[PDB]
Design a protein around this ligand. Structure first.
Ligand code: 8DG
Ligand SMILES: OC[C@H]1O[C@@](CO)(O[C@H]2O[C@H](CO)[C@@H](O)[C@H](O)[C@H]2O)[C@@H](O)[C@@H]1O
Ligand code: MN
Ligand code: MN
Ligand code: MN
Length: 129
């Protein structure tokens, strides 16, 4: 079965809002809300991957970020390891740089059912901050 390492960024502003995008209708986890991120490539580290993926997907460079959670999740047709980085400082203003919907969402209002099921413990832990 396909095995992937994924790095994602939890982009949190000073008003306790998170920058959330929505996945394409033809993607794995189609139409789900998501933290921006993507596949860790050969020859790059998880830290380098979350920087690159946020630059590509939402046009910011995360800096002075921390590992919030690392977990593994078995989907019906693939196994992924997710690296959730908490990003509270960055250069740039996040936007839908790849044409995808993105918007700021209050942390308290996040509904884990809107995200891939792999995110459930992370969304819960975020609400405990
Ligand atoms: N980006 C992201 N992916 C997540 C989250 N939760 C979760 O289970 N996933 C899963 C969905 C996908 O199987 C995988 C993410 O891969 P991706 O489709 O974002 O990869 P990518 O951006 O490198 O893909 P692409 O540029 O090649 O289209 O991890 C999340 O919060 N953010
Ligand atoms: O692994 C993240 C962890 O490392 C620290 C230093 O102890 O931060 C370093 O790593 C981050 C990710 O690459 C950098 O953004 C940061 O600038 C660097 O100091 C911790 O702050 C963090 O929890
Ligand atoms: Mn991507
Ligand atoms: Mn990618
Ligand atoms: Mn992605």
């Amino acid at each position: 079965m396909k095995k992937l390492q994924i790095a994602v960024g939890i982009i949190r502003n000073e008003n306790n809002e998170i920058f959330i995008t929505r996945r394409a209708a033809d993607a794995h986890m189609a139409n789900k809300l998501e933290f921006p991120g993507g596949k860790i490539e050969m020859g790059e580290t998880p830290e380098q991957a979350v920087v690159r993926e946020l630059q590509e997907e939402v046009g910011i460079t995360p800096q002075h970020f921390s590992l919030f959670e690392k977990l593994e999740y078995e989907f019906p047709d693939r196994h992924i390891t997710l690296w959730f980085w908490l990003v509270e400082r960055w250069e740039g203003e996040p936007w839908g740089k790849e044409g995808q919907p993105g918007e700021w969402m209050s942390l308290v209002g996040l509904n884990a059912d809107d995200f891939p099921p792999a995110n459930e413990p992370v969304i819960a832990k975020l609400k405990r901050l």
